[PDB]
């Protein structure tokens, strides 16, 4: 009953992370520049739709960690394997070491995501101020859910063992 609720939240957190890296609405800078992560899209001026890739280039090492979205993509790979691990526990039951594995990956997904947020704010900063777009909070909302999915996975592992 509660184990079935875990699968829905796993796919939900997997979705919101996939929408985040897809949509180009993470930041605004000045006319209006609705830039995401990989492609900077301009609006209100000469070219209205004509977009192009980002030209990025101790200080050298952080640049390549931003240029390649290494942490947030890893978070999704940990997350989708997590939901797969719960489905692997449904069939061939009574293993007593199935959902435990998934629980660690969901916690690791958030701990991978939380770095990706810190790196992005560190890279952006070097007078009109920047504002955070809707698709950024999608990454913020996904962290909270995955953490809640993580603790749920621990409760089921305790129940079967005891």
């Amino acid at each position: 009953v509660q184990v079935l609720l875990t699968t829905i939240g796993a796919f939900a957190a997997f979705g919101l992370m996939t929408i985040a890296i897809s949509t180009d609405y993470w930041l605004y800078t000045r006319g209006l520049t609705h830039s995401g992560l990989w492609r900077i899209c301009c609006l209100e001026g000469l070219k209205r739709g004509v977009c192009v890739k980002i030209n990025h280039f101790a200080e050298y090492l952080l640049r390549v960690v931003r240029a390649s979205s290494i942490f947030p993509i890893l978070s999704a790979i940990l997350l989708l394997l997590g939901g797969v691990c719960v489905a692997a526990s449904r069939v061939y039951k009574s293993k007593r070491n199935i959902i435990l594995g998934a629980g660690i990956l969901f916690v690791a997904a958030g701990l991978s995501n939380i770095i990706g947020v810190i790196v992005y704010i560190s890279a952006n900063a070097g007078k009109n101020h920047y504002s955070y777009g809707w698709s950024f909070y999608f990454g913020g909302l996904s962290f909270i859910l995955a953490e809640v999915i993580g603790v749920l996975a621990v409760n089921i592992y305790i129940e079967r063992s005891r």
Partner: protein
Amino acid sequence: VVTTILESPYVMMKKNHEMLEGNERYEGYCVDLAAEIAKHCGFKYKLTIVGDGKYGARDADTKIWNGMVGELVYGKADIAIAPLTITLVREEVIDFSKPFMSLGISIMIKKPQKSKPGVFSFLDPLAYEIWMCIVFAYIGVSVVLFLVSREFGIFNSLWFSLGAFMRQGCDISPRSLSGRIVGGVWWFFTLIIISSYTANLAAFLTVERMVSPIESAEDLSKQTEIAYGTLDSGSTKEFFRRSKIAVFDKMWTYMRSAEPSVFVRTTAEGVARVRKSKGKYAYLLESTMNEYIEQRKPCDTMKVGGNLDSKGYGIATPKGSSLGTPVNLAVLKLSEQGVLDKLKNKWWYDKGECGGSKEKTSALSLSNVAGVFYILVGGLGLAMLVALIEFCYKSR
């Protein structure tokens, strides 16, 4: 006839030069300097510009002089009041007056500005010597507590002195009289180190000091990090080549065998290379021009250290010099009165872009606190790893 040459601060063509024909077409230091000379000399001055656009040097092939120097010897120009360096070979051909201002070769660099705080920038208030002393001391207090006692083991004693320094109340307390002498003394250390940190960090954010990386010519002789050179061929380039003392001989070794060659065609190209590089290239030229460039817009370079050589400008007059005697004496009197210092203060300092310093405390950004965040999440991931293998080995 008064022969001069077009410079940046000395001879400037005024705005609406077509509207005003005569001596109103130009304005500068060298124009007013000629009027001060003709105040005690009975001569009629006419602002005539040399057509060549050259100071004066005898060519290797032709063996003939050009420009203001060429017009003097061949007999065309009467008087020459212009920024002209007084060298050995010039004295052989034409007579020179006494120096009216002194100059030399100096160092210029881009303004120091403000640095970006990267990672572990929060360990700035205290020296690197103190941090390591706290690490060693904490082991000593933990080890002594165990030996004093003989519950408190090696692992349990280390935790007590960690929780003590972080200033959080645990359930671990030494019950021995000997142990309570150790505990109370270690507590007083914790109280002063925390209070001293907070005080020194407050001083950093009240007044900010931007200090120069290089001080002297001997400083950039040892540092050997920032590139430095001169013009492709000039007066300062010829000075570097033939040097007796070892400090400039080691500098010419760098200047010659540079990868790539640090030489620019024009003096205007040298200034542009310093600002664009941003603390990567340092240019060497006359201290006179350097001080003028610093005062002009938009102010992003400054003079550093003393001068290396000592040269001077004078008033040039053709060979024989029938009218060169009185004007030489007149300048020496105007030097004493303080008219040369008054005129140099008018064009350099008075007419400038940047002159009040008002500081405003800004909110702390995440980039300067980023260091402690990496330590947190890094420590969390390590705790999961140790807990897993502790269970894995206990299972078998």
